[PDB]
Copies of this chain bind each other. A is one copy, B any other.
Amino acid sequence: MVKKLFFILSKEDKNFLFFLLVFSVFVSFIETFAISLVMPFITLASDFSYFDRNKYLISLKEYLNIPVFEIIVYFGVGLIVFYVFRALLNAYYFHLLARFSKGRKHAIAYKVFSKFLNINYEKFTQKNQSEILKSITGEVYNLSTMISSFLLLMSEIFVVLLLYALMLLINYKITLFLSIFMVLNAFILVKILSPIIKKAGLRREEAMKNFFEILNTNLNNFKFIKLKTKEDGVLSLFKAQSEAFSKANITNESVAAVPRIYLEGIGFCVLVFIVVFLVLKNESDISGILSTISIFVLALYRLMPSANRIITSYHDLLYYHSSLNIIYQNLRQEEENLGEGKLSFNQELKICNLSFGYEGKKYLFKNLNLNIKKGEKIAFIGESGCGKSTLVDLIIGLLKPKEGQILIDKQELNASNAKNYRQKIGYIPQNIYLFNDSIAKNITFGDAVDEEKLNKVIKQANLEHFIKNLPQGVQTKVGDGGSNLSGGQKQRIAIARALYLEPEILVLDQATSALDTQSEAKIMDEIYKISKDKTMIIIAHRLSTITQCDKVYRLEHGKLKEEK
């Protein structure tokens, strides 16, 4: 199950991962350094003696660039250099945690998306973009965030270990005491107060509900009240409920405050307790009294986040991780389509005993039979969801027929040539999705440009009077779908996009309703013109768009009739 993780992660990824591990432990040390360096600095900044015994300190003293006024000062400068240094080290560590997680999100998202773009058409189709978006987006977030969380978890569990070690070394007695005390407060808060608070909250809820209940009905009985004259009865009932509510409210609020108040007080108390019992055993009073206390204090506060991060991040390995890691293996060992080798289209697309059903699912056809002479311009009339869109989806490359054939010049369309067959159909979806970019792209669908092919295509789709009257011209961002674009231009742009692949079969998957019949008529006329040298299938939703079709088939549950 790490094999998963190291499969999903690249080489640079795995390396980066290990660097970040090491780095995590190293900052655990730099943390405990920052805490403990307070001990010697404070114990040597007072008392000034120490350079009067002890070989090392007096050796320093007799490096003589300074007396000791200036030695402690240099020591301070070294300390604030170190602390600045540590601030930088920590910033960089968190920045590298970000860099790792977000970079990995970028990489794994891209790998997953690619993986999806390669499954077969029905497979992609049969699940909702809600979930496919979740699959390449939310999951990748989870993995990323979680790995970073693990690294942070490491660094902090070592801060806890090292710091606890330090405390034990300096005064195992006190640290044992502080710890017993720690779990003691933990128990008091979480097992004695939290329940009382929670109840107080429920009491408040119920009392509020009841108060508002009879306030509301008293307001609803206003007419009956007004016809009594006297209002003392309801005011009575209301007073009683309002007192219940008020009371439960003052005690929920009262009890709520106890935990912080308790915390303030216990802090001071345990401090006094430490000095009153541990002034009975000393081992030198002086400034030393602050030396051993400060550490604990420091340590304790530094350990406060250590807890939280360790808790928080642990939860992140719970809620994410597990469920998620599999969802990559079982999403990127995902299988793709197939096929390679060509296929020619000069006579007819024959269909032959088609029959198709989606993976569920009773067939939509059974034994559909038709054929299309090259150039034929046909249309599929139908009762929408009767199967005509699916039919076209079979006639064009996508979707494997449950029973038919589909021959192209008497040659069977299948896995081996489907690439080359798919390659020869333009698409034109009427309700079109452009992406936010420079018209040229879309039209090219990314693929560089070709200026010439791009221009000839724009000319064909008669967008010429549009790309002339635009500021940036062919490079105008289209805002989204548009935003910058209106239906007619969107449509012509989609037509253009289709004509950039060029030939030889145009599908026109017209959407339902247009409320711009004039424009739809014009675009229809244009499309017919530009389908002169080509052959065209129309997934027709109207009629009146199909005036110029050589053939019209109506497909209804679940037979094909020729109409024309």
Interface residue SS majority, chain A:
helix
* A77 CA to B425 CA, complexed, in Å: 92
Name the residue of chain B whose CB is nearest to the CB of A397.
B227
User: Which listed residue, B34, B246, B253, touches A106 by the CB 8 Å rule?
Assistant: B246
Interface residues of A in 54-94 (CB under 8 A from B): 69, 72-73, 76-77, 79-80, 83-84, 86-87, 90-91, 94
Contact of A79 among B69, B227, B230, B272 (CB under 8 A): B272
Q: A451 within 8 Å of B by Cβ?
A: no
Q: Mark A198-220, 1 if CB is under 8 A from B, else 0.
A: 00000000000010111111111
Partner of A72, one of B110, B236, B279, B435: B279
Does A423 make an interface contact (CB < 8 A)? yes
Is B446 within 8 A of A237, CB to CB?
Answer: yes
Q: In the bound complex, how far is the Cα of B99 from the Cα of A375, in angstroms?
A: 88
A105, A219, A227: most-surrounded residue (chain B CB, <10 A)? A227
Q: A272-B80, A284-B45, A435-B218 are in contact. Are A105 and B237 (CB under 8 A)?
A: no
Report Cα–Cα, A245/B144, bound state, in Å. 14
B265 touches A427 (CB 8 A): no
> Looking across the interface, which residue of chain B has its beta carbon closest to that of A276?
B76
For residue A215, which residues in chain B have a CB less than 8 angstroms away from its CB?
113, 133, 136-137
Q: Which residues from 100 to 154 on chain A have a C-beta closer than 8 Å to any C-beta of chain B?
A: 102-103, 105-106, 109-110, 113-114, 117-118, 121, 124-125, 129, 132-133, 136-137
Q: Which one of A177-185, A286-294, A527-535 is at the B interface? A: A286-294
Determine the residue in chain B with the shortest Cβ distance to A225: B117
Q: Which of B98, B227, B288, B445 contacts A398 (CB 8 A)?
A: B227
On whether the beta carbons of A99 and B233 are closer than 8 Å, the reply is: no
Task: Give every chain B residue within 8 A of A268 (Cβ-Cβ).
Answer: 34, 38, 79-80, 83
Known contacts: A110-B242, A272-B41. The answer to whether A254 contacts B290 by CB under 8 A is no
- Docked pose: A32 CA to B329 CA in angstroms: 62
Q: Which of A256-264, A349-357, A358-366, A380-388 contacts B (4 or more CB under 8 A)?
A: A256-264
- Known A-B contacts A46-B289, A275-B41; the reply to A124 vs B210 at CB < 8 A is no
C-alpha spacing A265/B79, complex, angstroms: 11
CB pair B285 A216 closer than 8 Å: no
Given contacts A79-B272, A422-B226, contact A114 B231 (CB under 8 A): yes
Q: A227-B397, A237-B437 are in contact. Are A45 and B275 (CB under 8 A)?
A: yes
Task: Tell me whether A272 and B83 are in contact in the complex, defined as CB-CB below 8 angstroms, given that A238-B110, A238-B113, A250-B103 are known contacts.
Answer: yes
Specify how many copies of this chain sit in the oligomer.
2
Please indicate the chain B residues that have their CB under 8 angstroms from the CB of A113 in the complex: 215, 218, 235, 238
Given contacts A133-B216, A273-B80, contact A435 B237 (CB under 8 A): yes
Beta-carbon contact of B289 and A42 below 8 Å: yes
Q: Which residues, 310 to 341 on A, are CB-close (under 8 Å) to B?
A: none
Q: Is the CB of A290 within 8 A of B294?
A: yes
Residue A369, interface by CB 8 Å:
no
Known: A73-B276, A95-B253. 10 other contacts (CB 8 A): A42-B275, A48-B284, A79-B268, A84-B265, A87-B264, A113-B235, A114-B235, A129-B220, A233-B445, A234-B445
Can you list 24 pairs linking A and B with CB atoms under 8 Å apart? A76-B273, A87-B261, A87-B262, A95-B254, A95-B257, A99-B254, A102-B250, A105-B249, A113-B238, A117-B225, A125-B222, A136-B215, A137-B215, A213-B435, A223-B393, A228-B501, A229-B422, A230-B447, A234-B446, A235-B446, A237-B441, A287-B287, A287-B290, A290-B290
Binding site for B on A (CB under 8 A): 34, 38, 41-42, 45-48, 69, 72-73, 76-77, 79-80, 83-84, 86-87, 90-91, 94-95, 98-99, 102-103, 105-106, 109-110, 113-114, 117-118, 121, 124-125, 129, 132-133, 136-137, 210, 212-239, 242-243, 245-247, 249-251, 253-254, 257-258, 261-262, 264-265, 268-269, 271-273, 275-276, 279-280, 284-291, 294, 393, 396-398, 419, 422-423, 425, 427, 429, 433-437, 441, 444-448, 480-481, 497, 501
